[PDB]
Amino acid sequence: AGFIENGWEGLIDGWYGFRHQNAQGEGTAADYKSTQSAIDQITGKLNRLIEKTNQQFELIDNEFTEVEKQIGNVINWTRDSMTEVWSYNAELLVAMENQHTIDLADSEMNKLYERVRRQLRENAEEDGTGCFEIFHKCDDDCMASIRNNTYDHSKYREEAMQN
Amino acid sequence: AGFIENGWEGLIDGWYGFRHQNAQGEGTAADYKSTQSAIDQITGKLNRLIEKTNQQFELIDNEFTEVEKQIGNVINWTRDSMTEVWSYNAELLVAMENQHTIDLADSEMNKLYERVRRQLRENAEEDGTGCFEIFHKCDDDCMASIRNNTYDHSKYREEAMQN
Amino acid sequence: AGFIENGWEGLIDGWYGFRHQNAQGEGTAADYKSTQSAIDQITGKLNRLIEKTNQQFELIDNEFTEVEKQIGNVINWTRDSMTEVWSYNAELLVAMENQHTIDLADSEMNKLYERVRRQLRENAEEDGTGCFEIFHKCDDDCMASIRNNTYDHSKYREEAMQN
Amino acid sequence: ICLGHHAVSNGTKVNTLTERGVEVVNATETVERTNVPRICSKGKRTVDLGQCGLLGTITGPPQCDQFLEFSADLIIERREGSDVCYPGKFVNEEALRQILRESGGIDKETMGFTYSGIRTNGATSACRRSGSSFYAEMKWLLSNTDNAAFPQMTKSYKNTRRDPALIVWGIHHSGSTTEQTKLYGSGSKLITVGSSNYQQSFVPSPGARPQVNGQSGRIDFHWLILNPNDTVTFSFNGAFIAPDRASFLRGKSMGIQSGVQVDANCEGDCYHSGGTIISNLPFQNINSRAVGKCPRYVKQESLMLATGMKNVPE
Ligand SMILES: *[C@@H]1O[C@H](CO)[C@@H](O)[C@H](O)[C@H]1NC(C)=O
Ligand SMILES: *[C@@H]1O[C@H](CO)[C@@H](O)[C@H](O)[C@H]1NC(C)=O
Ligand SMILES: *[C@@H]1O[C@H](CO)[C@@H](O)[C@H](O)[C@H]1NC(C)=O
Ligand SMILES: *[C@@H]1O[C@H](CO)[C@@H](O)[C@H](O)[C@H]1NC(C)=O
Ligand SMILES: *[C@@H]1O[C@H](CO)[C@@H](O)[C@H](O)[C@H]1NC(C)=O
């Protein structure tokens, strides 16, 4: 997500998609495997995080009738230290899991990018902006064949080597 | 470990290795540098994790004769809060270091993969399943040279460009 | 920073740079975008991290006239547990952010390398030592065009395809 | 071309999740070690109690007259600061000290206690400035002239202010029963202190004690906190150190226990016995008991946060 100029706004159903701009026309489709894996990983991370505590805490301090002042300050200081360390742990965890979510999105993105590279030996190459320059013409069949991960490159090699 | 269909079960000595399927036959070998780096990093992580603490706690509550109920409940609540924060920190640490070890294995695999593609400029290309398609004939000396990081691609370029 | 043999000592102003060693002469220049992004990310991490607490504690113990020994032991044990958990959190913090800073520097290096290889379709090829081999001759304008992220690979293809 | 990064001959060793002591081009501090050995607190009101003590500000021994009723946003106590002139302890000592630390200063106002036909000017050889005297806001209620009965007194004081008052009174356990009869007379003296939330009562107990500050008997100062529109009745038959003035809280402050001198050359945040921890780092390793909004304590001597890349020498 670093070498791309901008993200698409018309991509609604899928997180990661595909555009063609071939001679047949213009089409914007959505990949399924990469976005399913990304949503599965992130939802698993959420389900790990979204978990109410098992440990049961009781009332240690009285709001109405104030407890003895020494033990009251001891309880207040213990609760304040626990509150500070919990706020610290919460902000640290939120920051690093947002970082890991962004890195996971980038990892799924360039994993799809590198698997598209692997599917296209020399029939296509990158432009640096996230697009692949196809060296063969197909009537929107090889578009879906790249999309469906059922692309055969060896039959398209002879007309793409000389170009 | 992303583009590979399945990991090898016949590899025992190392962690990352090579399969041959050449004209001489079929053979399995084990890389040494990448697995040494991975095991060194993971064992260093274990060494910095597997450490008995220096802080020496004292007995604050009495198991046999119960202490005064107010200060005893304060001790119980402090111990329960510290148990909860230590359990949360333990889950956090275990989860993030398991993620980091998985990502470290993936990154060591990726580093070996990119260094193999860097060794062989055009003599071999990926297929998407983790293999490299050699475009020259060589009887186990070139492949061991690939393993030994002593591959001389300059004397193999002439017969691999036209293919 | 994996495939690179060593870091340059003469690169002073920039973190990530460029060496050409072309026929025109010798010169070590510095990239600006990658090092600016890396320093911005690391300084943002520091500004997130270097932050005095907004919560103000009070004196719970007494240095001069020692408090009652039971509540004194409770305060000492609570402070020791808080000190131990803060020390563990601090060393975990330092370890994982040093790991993330090293990984961020490696990722910025990899992103710069990949964007250079994306600018250089076939006119240049990778080496494995972090260098690029050029199939065309060009006098310090192409090199700056690579540095300025304004490379025009369209009109270098005719003399570099056969090489 | 050749593409690469920068490095230095001498970098920094930092700790990392995989390897310990890895070499980086540059690194920064996260655990502060440099401690300012001065309580530098410019921008806030401060009082240096010195040879006076924080709890001595209430009762008023000779060392604590200057800071008898003060006002500050920072209170500083010293080890040499004594809380009492006539010897004796404080019940709930740390509770009263922590109340005074958050007082923001204290204000003394008279209770209007009128005593009829009974000598009230206490005088001890220990609590002395120029002659035999006693505390500032405490009145030692002796007998009339000599061994004589002490009439039962019922003195009621009502806190009419809008803030919760603080009342400190004293109990005299004489050095002997004969001394107690000299000062208050024969009979079992019994004293009750009554409030809405306070009803504790107690009996003075004469007996021999070691000579502390050149005196035998000990006076224990009890205390309570009065809510607004609440009254305290002292019903004492004898042997009472009556409160002439009630102490009132002023605002919010924080109390430190240091031993270094005070200046105004900083913007300090937290303080301790070694001085001031002025820094912006998240962690510190100077004192475990630094109080204020500042870095937290850690067990490690030093942690290096890698600011630069992992460098390899050429
Ligand atoms: C302790 O904290 C509670 C808030 O959680 C506060 O209402 C209470 O006044 C505090 N106690 C003292 C003695 O400051
Ligand atoms: C405090 O915890 C211990 C075990 O950790 C338990 O045996 C004890 O009963 C608890 N005290 C109270 C008052 O519940
Ligand atoms: C509590 O810890 C402090 C240092 O933080 C130490 O000076 C004191 O002696 C300890 N108290 C006891 C009772 O050990
Ligand atoms: C290295 O880091 C320190 C942080 O203490 C900083 O003051 C210094 O300017 C840095 N040096 C360079 C060359 O970045
Ligand atoms: C306290 O008493 C005064 C006078 O009787 C009255 O004006 C005020 O409202 C009372 N306050 C409370 C809290 O009862």
mmCIF file with all atom_site columns, C-alpha atoms in Angstrom, chain B residues 24 29 33 53 55 61 72 75 79 89 101 106-107 111 113 120 126 129 134 141 145 153-154:
data_model
loop_
_atom_site.group_PDB
_atom_site.id
_atom_site.type_symbol
_atom_site.label_atom_id
_atom_site.label_alt_id
_atom_site.label_comp_id
_atom_site.label_asym_id
_atom_site.label_entity_id
_atom_site.label_seq_id
_atom_site.pdbx_PDB_ins_code
_atom_site.Cartn_x
_atom_site.Cartn_y
_atom_site.Cartn_z
_atom_site.occupancy
_atom_site.B_iso_or_equiv
_atom_site.pdbx_formal_charge
_atom_site.auth_seq_id
_atom_site.auth_comp_id
_atom_site.auth_asym_id
_atom_site.auth_atom_id
_atom_site.pdbx_PDB_model_num
ATOM 1  C CA . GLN B 1 24  ? 20.615 -36.947 -12.272 1.00 0.00 ? 24  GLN B CA 1
ATOM 2  C CA . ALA B 1 29  ? 19.265 -31.203 0.876   1.00 0.00 ? 29  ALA B CA 1
ATOM 3  C CA . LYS B 1 33  ? 22.813 -20.395 6.982   1.00 0.00 ? 33  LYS B CA 1
ATOM 4  C CA . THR B 1 53  ? 13.093 -12.782 38.041  1.00 0.00 ? 53  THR B CA 1
ATOM 5  C CA . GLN B 1 55  ? 12.857 -9.325  42.476  1.00 0.00 ? 55  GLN B CA 1
ATOM 6  C CA . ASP B 1 61  ? -0.767 -12.957 53.796  1.00 0.00 ? 61  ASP B CA 1
ATOM 7  C CA . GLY B 1 72  ? -6.708 -9.006  54.214  1.00 0.00 ? 72  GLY B CA 1
ATOM 8  C CA . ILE B 1 75  ? -4.154 -7.807  50.035  1.00 0.00 ? 75  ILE B CA 1
ATOM 9  C CA . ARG B 1 79  ? -3.008 -9.847  44.467  1.00 0.00 ? 79  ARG B CA 1
ATOM 10 C CA . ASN B 1 89  ? 0.720  -9.546  29.990  1.00 0.00 ? 89  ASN B CA 1
ATOM 11 C CA . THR B 1 101 ? 8.273  -16.265 15.436  1.00 0.00 ? 101 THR B CA 1
ATOM 12 C CA . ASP B 1 106 ? 8.173  -16.529 6.992   1.00 0.00 ? 106 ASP B CA 1
ATOM 13 C CA . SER B 1 107 ? 10.782 -13.769 6.647   1.00 0.00 ? 107 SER B CA 1
ATOM 14 C CA . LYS B 1 111 ? 15.062 -13.975 2.533   1.00 0.00 ? 111 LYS B CA 1
ATOM 15 C CA . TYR B 1 113 ? 13.826 -17.163 -1.616  1.00 0.00 ? 113 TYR B CA 1
ATOM 16 C CA . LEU B 1 120 ? 20.099 -16.680 -10.580 1.00 0.00 ? 120 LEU B CA 1
ATOM 17 C CA . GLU B 1 126 ? 9.562  -18.900 -9.935  1.00 0.00 ? 126 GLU B CA 1
ATOM 18 C CA . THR B 1 129 ? 4.637  -23.085 -5.711  1.00 0.00 ? 129 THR B CA 1
ATOM 19 C CA . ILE B 1 134 ? 16.267 -24.023 -14.169 1.00 0.00 ? 134 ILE B CA 1
ATOM 20 C CA . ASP B 1 141 ? 27.541 -29.037 -9.051  1.00 0.00 ? 141 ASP B CA 1
ATOM 21 C CA . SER B 1 145 ? 26.998 -24.054 -5.718  1.00 0.00 ? 145 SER B CA 1
ATOM 22 C CA . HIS B 1 153 ? 25.695 -17.085 -13.210 1.00 0.00 ? 153 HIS B CA 1
ATOM 23 C CA . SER B 1 154 ? 27.996 -15.269 -15.656 1.00 0.00 ? 154 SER B CA 1
#
